[PDB]
């Protein structure tokens, strides 16, 4: 019955936990509870290591007990909430956090936890308010501070920015060195001024989280295959993604599983997510050699087995530290070779990841210590995209002359050719080359349809769709799931763009912008007097913030023009209206990059050190356009301005991008696949020859 005994035990276990020795800690707590079953704090403690070991179901039951025993235990509620949160029961997590606050209004953690839920839900403004409260209540509070900081980042609140950055760094530094799990998230790390050293460390500790979660499974190391004997000479490659369905990953690589050489390769896709219905999921399922739904198999043990089971030589992690990820699977080491690829733009910083697949531009050898994995280079760029398949109606365009611009009123359509031929007067500017519809009555009707805001019209029997109503005419087209079967009109007037300006665009989510980035753009716009910047309300709540800072830089409001976010296909297609994209140098447009290039719209970039900031450069290089790549702020602005003012040049460059986007290897997925295949072989040779992972710079 003895509380004093039980008390003592507890103290020791706390200690045991201090020295990371979770193993032992747990054993002690459970003994404490055996001596004293009505021991609130024991229950609580035990609960939170069970939580850390990922034994949620049980961890939960303990928190329940603690609370029942000691109903004023605000702390217990708050953690129990976190458990529920991780259990996907947001409903219940929410209840806990709020009970905590109600029981003890002064309790900073619950405020912060609450904010977190909001944050994950999208509601940033409320996330912020709650963080601020938590911080007011407890001013030294790293999780709060760092999350808040990212919220602010996301809506471009740049109050105290410089000094905020210092503090972040300072907090990380402190946390790392005091061996505490750092408050900045590995994915976000990429946005703040931290040493590559630090970024890597962050990734590192987050990796260890998986270790704890699989260690309690006590699984013996796996037996890995050593030859391609059992797999009939074919190397077996496992792609693991929670994004097989409508998500950027699939919009880049859906074609690839399909394009592997069956003679030498057997492809296994492991979905970490339930089939969302979309044709993305359909196609990958249709085309992979084996499609395996792991969202079915919650247990990582079982799932890891199921991989090993399949006899995978190389396992590919398309997720890194993003939503949906199950790195535990990688941490269990079911396959001999395990590589990061495509999905996540940074190091895993983790022992269980052997390679990261990248390229010479994105990750030159100078900055190789950013990464904990060995570099495996693709030959040009490691980036790829399905645009060629998804969006073949943007392979060609036509325009209308209402006075000759390539980007004022644009038509694309699979049957576009066919239609022009029914037309009387089509002049044909050379470069393929661009057909120009003169100001007929036809031209008028079209432009009138646009102006009247009508859905679509018919002309000589061809449907001519207003490219703002795509979802109304065919939602499958609008999302990328189908190729449109109409001819689509796209116009500056649709988005309230000036018919006679230089349009600089950036379609990234606004969190990729910082003060200095906006700065540069300000300078460009001042030096290109007849120009506007085109941006996305992404989130909308960020727009007034940009507008604000825009004006302290002394730009009249009307110099920056916001549009709403649009369905994948409209978003891509309307990039044809821009003259030049200006890439965020803090974090490059990745998918966004490919989308802008597909429209034929040169992009000006300023590669940094972090992988994430060198991707646009890498893409441009593969495309063949080094004159778009700045070495510094100065050069960037010049390149911008030149293209803004020298219309001759612009016409040249734009024409190049447009042609190159076909002729270069960038958007060629077949070639890409084949490259990816050699690179795989290389990796296997090297392992099958008996070596440990080493850089594959070919």
């Amino acid at each position: 019955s003895c509380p004093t005994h039980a008390d003592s035990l507890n103290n020791l276990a706390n200690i045991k936990r201090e020295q990371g020795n979770i193993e032992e800690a747990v054993r002690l707590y459970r003994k404490a509870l055996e001596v004293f079953p009505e021991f609130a704090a024991a229950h609580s403690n035990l609960a939170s290591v069970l939580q850390q070991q990922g034994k949620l179901q049980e961890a939960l039951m303990h928190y329940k007990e603690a609370i029942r025993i000691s109903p004023t235990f605000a702390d217990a509620y708050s953690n129990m909430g976190n458990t529920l949160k991780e259990m996907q029961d947001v409903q219940g997590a929410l209840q806990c956090y709020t009970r905590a606050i109600q029981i003890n209004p002064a309790f900073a953690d619950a405020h912060s936890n609450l904010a977190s839920i909001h944050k994950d839900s999208g509601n940033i403004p409320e996330a912020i308010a709650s963080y601020r409260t938590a911080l007011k209540l407890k001013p030294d509070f790293p999780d709060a501070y760092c999350n808040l900081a990212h919220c602010l980042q996301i809506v471009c609140d740049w109050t105290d920015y410089d000094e905020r950055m210092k503090k972040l760094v300072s907090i990380v530094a402190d946390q790392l060195e005091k061996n505490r799990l750092p408050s900045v998230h590995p994915h976000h790390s990429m946005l703040y001024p931290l040493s590559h050293g630090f970024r890597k460390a962050i990734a590192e500790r987050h990796g260890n989280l998986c270790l704890d979660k699989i260690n309690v499974l006590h699984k013996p190391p796996y037996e890995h295959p050593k030859d391609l004997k059992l797999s009939d000479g074919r190397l077996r490659v496992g792609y693991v993604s929670s994004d097989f369905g409508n998500h950027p990953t699939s919009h880049l690589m859906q074609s690839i599983p399909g394009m592997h050489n069956p003679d030498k390769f057997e492809v296994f896709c492991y979905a970490l997510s339930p089939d969302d219905g979309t044709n993305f999921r359909v196609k990958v399922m249709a085309e992979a050699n084996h499609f395996i739904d792991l969202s079915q198999i919650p247990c990582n043990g079982k799932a890891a087995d199921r991989i090993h089971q399949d006899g995978i030589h190389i396992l590919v992690n398309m997720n890194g530290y993003t939503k949906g990820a199950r790195n535990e699977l990688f941490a269990l080491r079911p396959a001999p070779i395990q590589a990061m690829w495509l999905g996540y733009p940074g190091t895993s910083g983790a022992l269980f990841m052997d390679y990261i697949i990248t390229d010479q531009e994105t990750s030159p050898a100078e900055v190789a210590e950013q990464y904990s994995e060995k570099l495996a280079y693709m030959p040009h760029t490691f980036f790829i995209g399905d645009h060629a398949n998804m969006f073949p109606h943007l392979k060609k365009k036509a325009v209308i002359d209402f006075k000759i611009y390539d980007n004022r009123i644009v038509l694309n359509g699979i049957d576009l050719k066919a239609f022009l031929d029914s037309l009387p007067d089509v002049k044909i500017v050379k470069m393929l080359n661009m057909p120009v519809i003169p100001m007929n009555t036809i031209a008028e009707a079209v432009i009138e349809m646009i102006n009247r805001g009508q859905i679509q019209i018919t002309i000589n029997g061809f449907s001519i769709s207003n490219g703002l109503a795509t979802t109304q005419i065919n939602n499958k087209a609008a999302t990328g799931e189908e190729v449109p079967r109409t001819i689509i009109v796209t116009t500056r007037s649709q988005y309230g763009l000036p018919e006679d300006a230089i349009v600089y665009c950036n379609f990234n989510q606004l969190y990729k912008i910082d003060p200095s980035t906006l700065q540069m753009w300000a300078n460009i716009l001042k030096r290109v007097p007849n120009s506007v910047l085109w941006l996305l309300r992404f989130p909308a709540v960020g727009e007034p913030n940009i507008q604000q800072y825009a004006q302290n830089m002394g730009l009249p409001q009307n110099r920056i023009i916001f549009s709403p976010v649009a369905p994948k296909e409209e978003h891509v297609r309307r990039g044809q209206l821009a003259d030049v994209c200006l890439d965020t140098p803090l974090c490059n447009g990745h998918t966004t990059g490919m989308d802008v290039l597909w429209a034929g719209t040169p992009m000006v970039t300023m590669p940094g050190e972090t992988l994430a900031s060198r991707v646009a450069a890498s893409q441009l290089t593969c495309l063949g356009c080094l004159e778009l790549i700045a070495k510094n702020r100065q050069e960037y602005e010049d390149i911008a301005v030149k293209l803004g003012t020298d219309l001759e040049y612009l016409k040249k460059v734009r024409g190049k991008v447009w042609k190159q986007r076909i002729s270069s290897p960038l958007f060629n997925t077949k070639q890409y696949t084949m490259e990816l295949e050699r690179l795989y072989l290389q990796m296997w040779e090297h392992y099958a020859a008996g070596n440990k992972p080493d850089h594959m710079i070919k």
Binding site: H150, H185, H187, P248, T322, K323, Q509, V565, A566, P567
Partner: peptide, 11 residues
Amino acid sequence: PVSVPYSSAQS
């Protein structure tokens, strides 16, 4: 109008 899925955090 519209929301598109994108690459995000985790926590």
